[PDB]
Design a protein around this nucleic acid. Sequence first.
DNA 1: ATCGGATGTATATATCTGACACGTGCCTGGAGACTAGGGAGTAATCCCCTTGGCGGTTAAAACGCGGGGGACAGCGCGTACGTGCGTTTAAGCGGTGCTAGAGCTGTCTACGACCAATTGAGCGGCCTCGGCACCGGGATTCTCGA
DNA 2: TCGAGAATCCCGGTGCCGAGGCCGCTCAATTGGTCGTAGACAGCTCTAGCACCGCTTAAACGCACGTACGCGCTGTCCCCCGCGTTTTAACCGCCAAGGGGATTACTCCCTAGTCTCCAGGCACGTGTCAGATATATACATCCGAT
Lengths: 107, 107, 308, 98, 98, 303, 216, 93, 93, 82, 82, 153
Amino acid sequence: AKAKTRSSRAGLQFPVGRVHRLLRKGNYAERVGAGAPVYLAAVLEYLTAEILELAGNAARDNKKTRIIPRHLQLAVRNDEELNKLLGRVTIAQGGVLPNIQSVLLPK
Amino acid sequence: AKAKTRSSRAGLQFPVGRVHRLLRKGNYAERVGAGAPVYLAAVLEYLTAEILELAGNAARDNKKTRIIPRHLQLAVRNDEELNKLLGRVTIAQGGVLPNIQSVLLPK
Amino acid sequence: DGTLDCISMALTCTFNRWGTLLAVGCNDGRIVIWDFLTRGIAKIISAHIHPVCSLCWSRDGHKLVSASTDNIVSQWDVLSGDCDQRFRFPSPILKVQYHPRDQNKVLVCPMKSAPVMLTLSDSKHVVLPVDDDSDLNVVASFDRRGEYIYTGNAKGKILVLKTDSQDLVASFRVTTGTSNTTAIKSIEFARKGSCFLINTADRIIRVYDGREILTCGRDGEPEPMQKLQDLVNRTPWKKCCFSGDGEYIVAGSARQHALYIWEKSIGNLVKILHGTRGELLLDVAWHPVRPIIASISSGVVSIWAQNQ
Amino acid sequence: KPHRYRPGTVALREIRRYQKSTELLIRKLPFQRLVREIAQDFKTDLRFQSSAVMALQEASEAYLVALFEDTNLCAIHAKRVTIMPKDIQLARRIRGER
Amino acid sequence: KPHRYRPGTVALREIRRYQKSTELLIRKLPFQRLVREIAQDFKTDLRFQSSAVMALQEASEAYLVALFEDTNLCAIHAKRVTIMPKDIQLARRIRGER
Amino acid sequence: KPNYALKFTLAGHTKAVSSVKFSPNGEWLASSSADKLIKIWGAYDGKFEKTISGHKLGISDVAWSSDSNLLVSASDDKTLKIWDVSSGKCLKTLKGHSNYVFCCNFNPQSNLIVSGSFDESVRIWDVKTGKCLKTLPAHSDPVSAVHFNRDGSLIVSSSYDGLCRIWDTASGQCLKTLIDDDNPPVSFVKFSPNGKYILAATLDNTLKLWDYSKGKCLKTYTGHKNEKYCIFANFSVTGGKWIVSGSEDNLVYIWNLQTKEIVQKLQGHTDVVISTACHPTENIIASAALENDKTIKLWKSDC
Amino acid sequence: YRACLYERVLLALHDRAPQLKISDDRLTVVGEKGYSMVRASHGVRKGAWYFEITVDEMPPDTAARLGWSQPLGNLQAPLGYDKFSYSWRSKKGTKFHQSIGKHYSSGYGQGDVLGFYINLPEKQTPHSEIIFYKNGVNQGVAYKDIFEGVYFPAISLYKSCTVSINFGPCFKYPPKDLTYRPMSDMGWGAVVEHTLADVLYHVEEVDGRRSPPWEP
Amino acid sequence: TRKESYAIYVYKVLKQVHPDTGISSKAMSIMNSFVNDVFERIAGEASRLAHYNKRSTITSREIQTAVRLLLPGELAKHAVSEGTKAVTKYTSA
Amino acid sequence: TRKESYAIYVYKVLKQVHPDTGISSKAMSIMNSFVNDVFERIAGEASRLAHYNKRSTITSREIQTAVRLLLPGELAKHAVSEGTKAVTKYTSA
Amino acid sequence: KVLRDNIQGITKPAIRRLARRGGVKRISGLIYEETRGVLKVFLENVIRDAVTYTEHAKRKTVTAMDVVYALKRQGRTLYGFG
Amino acid sequence: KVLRDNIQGITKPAIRRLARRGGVKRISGLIYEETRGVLKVFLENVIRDAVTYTEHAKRKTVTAMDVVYALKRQGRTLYGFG
Amino acid sequence: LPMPMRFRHLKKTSKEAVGVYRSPIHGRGLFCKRNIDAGEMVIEYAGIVIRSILTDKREKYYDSKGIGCYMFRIDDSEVVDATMHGNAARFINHSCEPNCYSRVINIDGQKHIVIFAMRKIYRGEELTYDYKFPIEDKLPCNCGAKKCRKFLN
DNA sequence: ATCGGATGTATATATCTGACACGTGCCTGGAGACTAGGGAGTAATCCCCTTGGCGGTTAAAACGCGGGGGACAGCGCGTACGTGCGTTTAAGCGGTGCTAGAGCTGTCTACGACCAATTGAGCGGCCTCGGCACCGGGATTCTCGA
DNA sequence: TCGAGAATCCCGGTGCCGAGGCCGCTCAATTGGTCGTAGACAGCTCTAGCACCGCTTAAACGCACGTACGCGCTGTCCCCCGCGTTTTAACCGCCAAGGGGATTACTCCCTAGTCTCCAGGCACGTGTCAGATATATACATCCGAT
């Protein structure tokens, strides 16, 4: 009996075994549903895809292959729903997305 | 088979057995420290004492036997430590403590 | 608060034992001994062609030790003005100091070399020890009675020797708070009691009681009686001195030509005196038995009294 | 001759009595209708507890008086006794509500 | 004749390059000494990770630029380009920091 | 008790003598009078040393220097005059008192002068430049006597208005004002040798020793007669502790210092014994009488 | 303003000697050496009025004196040493004035609650008099000859005397006269009068002054 | 359906502090909700810490530490004392 | 010490979306911390709602509901659809 | 029974009453509707999240404990409702 | 080794650098020390709470994960440190 | 500004704000050396604070000594007697048109009689206030004012 | 700055009551007693990060130094907002009545729990090399006086 | 306003180490039984919600109107920006000691889990007074004339 990872049968990239391990070790319920780690890991993969895509957009806009935290912070403050999700979150080497106020301009 | 509850064994009021069952059903840790319910319930006893005491202070300050939630709001807004404890907390029928800004007064 | 037009090129001054006369050095290298009561010059001595940067009275007041910028030290009788003795060294002299209880002896702090204690009777000299052997800048001073010698290096190390044997009777290094040393700018003592002060490169004056250093022993952690500074401007101190009694301390802000006055016990700032914003503050001294303070700035002396 | 109190004075006393009072200052039924209108947007024909909607209105009004409060404060920093929409907007901005 | 840019202009470019840059703007050692000074208040002779203190300073500076940001915004609502302490205080007030 | 006997009688002032003072070394006796003349005499033999003139009007007071080298002369010409006692040279002439100068005294360090005048203002003077450094509306009546404390920190002043006022020297601050329940015209005042007490004569045949720290009269001395003239009082210390003074009855009164009782009455003067001086070292007392006597008498006792 | 640090009209602390101690538990007054004098807050200028003194301690070497005194009364003197003070010595009832003692009086008791009646008109002041009572019982007239000038009730202490002044609404044996006024009444009368004095002096700020038909 | 609460206990401690002062049911349920909230606060915090310690057991030391984290200054101090008292009183059982 | 992370799966899904891109290890750690954050968020919310439902079993319905509670609009919609498709795929075998 | 426009059912007198409670003296008109919007936006979240709870609750009526856990999750917790 | 007064070790140039990063043109002096205070106050919490963690950690050195969980509990979470 | 703070400022600036010179009013008097604004503290009439009952005993005392009485009524209970101990305020002449006015202030429980400026007083001006002396039976006034009562009393 | 009048507000009173304190019978969670395992605690070991110091540099901080720029104070006006009084209006009481849906019990069953046997996906560790960071230099563009 | 000058952008070239790729080397993931049980679901209540409708009225909307703060503009001061210089200590690189952090291996104290019994808690009735409410009253305070 060959052993394949459950994420393969889920066709995903993040290790659902490690997921369910953290789940049981997380003291959330007496017994975790079978497909619940699968579902949440799928959500995780999707959102990671979104954020990494935004980051790659920013970096290539800046003509950069290696993506520095600044790109990610900029994308964060560029996605309104993601920002809402993460506005309460602080970002190392984030800096501030360029924001210029009106009355600040000269004449 | 002499009976004596752990609250009496601590000479306190909050139900050590009940809160122990509660934390057990709360799924936070596999095993528990038997004295942790005692300790926490004692802390609750203390803080409850202070807050109800300030509440009653406002109450008889208003000739009020039965304490009103407005007394509670005033109490929690007066004490710095308790206010800090419950800053982002809201209270039903709370209202706002008396506060008029300086420039609000006409000269 | 009162200046003197009759003297020019004021560079360094020194009160006599009773605060009756003031010997001020001039750029021409002359001693102008000016009197407080008659409010006039009492004597003019052709000391050096080189300006005088260090001046000290004798206990009897009949002798004054002077140091030229030509590395020329000379003793002069105040009545006659003759050069009683004259010596010269390498590493130009930073300071001279009569021994308070033996005017025959005088300590000398040179620029690059260790301070040496000479006698006038015999032209001998005793080189005082140096802890780190590489300070090249150590200020030194007798205590109030001349029983011990306090030497502070550019590396915050403080040695207390006995004046006769030069033996290390106490030691400790002052700190910049965190872990660092600071250049000991100067060591001053009180003419009354045992409290003394240290001016350091951190612009922070540290007041101690020498008995506490003596009981602290060698290589100890003696805390200061007081810590004094301009927390507002963070100003260096070109020259500081106690009061005559020893309960008031003054510092000269040459950065802005001002004078800060704190207490000893509490340490709170008594007051501030503001001089000419264009004057560069150079020298500071207190009347030993009066609330009178002499200041030398841009070659001009000013007097600051305090009335009832 | 008819008397009229100087401006604000009546409103000042209103402030005083409102900090004195503690009950709600919103009519129940309009608030409830608004809540149900909002509800049908996400799903239609949903029922509610009177306790639930009382909680909604109380918590709302609390947030609202807090907003009015700190916007008053900001307007103090704006050196005005009149309120400006920008005050509310920037308050939410500092409140992370933007 | 000597040239001097008009006020703010140089500071404006500084703003531009700082929004351009991302690294820290605080000298490491002073911040670290401050942290250890604060630490000895609660308990003396406690050690730290360089990573830990780097996190401290980064997170601080983040909170600090956020405070500067929304206080700038408030000062816009204050119709001034100069900052006033009351702006910061009331900002914390809206930030629930009072 | 003293046994002062007349040893030398001195005279020569053409007018009423106003003051006689022993030199601090006890070598000379300076006698001032209204004749615009001062007379230095030998303090042990009654030998007339010399006469120093130069003042334009009558002289109301003269005071020695501490080193026995200078003499300040306060004259009715509204002027002081500082003289070298050895050369008799008018080293300085102090102008600025608007009326008759009546008293004058050096500081304990001899470098400063206090002066009282009819102008009812006390002037404070330099010695080496002779410059008036301070001027105080001290009293509401012409000043009678001014004097320094032991060190020169305090200046006591008396005047005809009956006030005895202690003033700060460095500031002119009116430190104290001694009152004795009445307004007795105080014609003389001076500090105690220890600077702890003050002897003041009032023009009612009464002398009063006050404590300075207490501000109250400690002792009183009567039996003499003094109601119009500036009769001087001195502390006899070279022998027993006594209080010596003149009197309008031609007597030279000597009371015990502590018991306040008269310990001697030197008679032989024919006019009011106007001025008195006690020797600093010996038991010698110079008593000078007024114009109906014009004589100064040396008295020597054995204790 | 002349605001007085007093809940009721009491013995004014502004007019006591430095050797005069008070206990506000009974507002009693006591001393240590010799005699001294204290006075009340109020002062009579016209009409008839009445107060009391309650004695709480009278050892043999303890003799208080109680009466009235006009200003010019040196508060170190024993309340009757001058001609402006008229008191009673609390050893035997003896009227003391000009330091002169007169036995035209009754006898005093150690625990006497003594009533003090005094009537000044609106060179003796016409029809003015002083009457002394022992617990309301008439001890008799003390002084008919009363000089001009305002008077105030005063207490003199000898070595460690304990006595206290007391007003009318808490009295023990009060006269039922409708004209006499307690201590508190004249007290607030004088307080209001001095309030108006401040008013009028600050007015004298504005040009002009004007007062009604003089009689009152 | 039995619904547990602490109105009994809050009333007990009320009397223990104020036998005279009464209580309203509204404020009663307020107290109950509040204590539930703060108990969940301390529970989550202590569990988080122990997870950091990776210790599957939750003991009193965790409670002390986490309430110290929770309470503003002196409260905690006071608090911990009685807590200690409690366990002492219970360890002395 | 065996420490577990997800940066390998980060690189995987990156290549899945951007094959020609590199990352800063710093950014990888940031993203992994973000993963942990969202995971604890969703887990806590699910446990809390199950507690409200008194459920001791956290299943995919809880997952979807809690995501909807957390994610906004089309984010939530797409995430729900994706989790649904994935659990369908896994349940298909 | 399709509802609408109850937002303006919020009376300007009600708004100014709340403002006076907040200690406000002078107010402009432009606020109220703006205010209303915010109000809406604010509640815009909670009810949804609340019914989201009710979503998982599989129930047709909405309860207080829903908004309790919402305000909790919204960091604006409230007391007095279990 | 007792430390002190490193708060003023924060240079005004550093403060204005941070301000320019925040996009600020004109600044007053009164801010900086005030600023500093806030800074202190801010960190005043975290370190303590952090060492509180270290308190329960029973360790002498302080780690990043401490401040991580603090800022988390302080609702100011940060990434990039495990 | 606080009456204590204002009083500290007044006692700090009094020595350099005013002077005493020969006066055309009479003898010597107080002149302004630096422009004084209206209502601001000009000078304290500092002296010996005594009770009222002790006034006469002092006055007669001075009457026995021929020394003039320098006393100002603080109130019905206190008086600042500056006869023997005072300050420069003993040289403030009177004018029927005063640019100054006396007021009693309470600092830390003690009363101070401060002459404030009725108007903006400029440098060189002689300082005068209303003594408000009651009408006697006569001191002629030479204040120079056109409204001068010809008599203080 | 005051007084008079208007008005609004704190008080005492009376009674009504419905929450509310109080007591019950009955239930089950808590206590009490007993068993196991194994998380926790202790200890010896290793490592190794940290904390300490030392010397040279300069970019950075301190400090000074005009000086234009705006903070601010004041000053006119006017429009927008309190207010008190009108008006009309839904809000609230309340009470009715239906049931849809919570809300409860009773199954039974699929479903992880769990353990055991198996291992390859993944992770620490080791090369490696190329975007990337730095640098120098040239060309571009903003800005401040015409 | 067209140049001078200055800060910047970009280009080529240099050298590097982190990003990455691959390699041993597991333990944690998978697989497969097996079991007790969470809840899925059905099937009942009942009640709280939902709507109906009427009656009263406090409340809401709008008006008119004074008015007064918002706003807009001017001139001043001072003061913070910009640049120049001087001083310094952060940094950086290296070294070194040890002290704590992490590890592993035992060891066992304590807690989970079980079973028993009951007693405190809880739903449920039950009088009953704290206070809600209304009213007349006495006090406080604004607003305008003086």
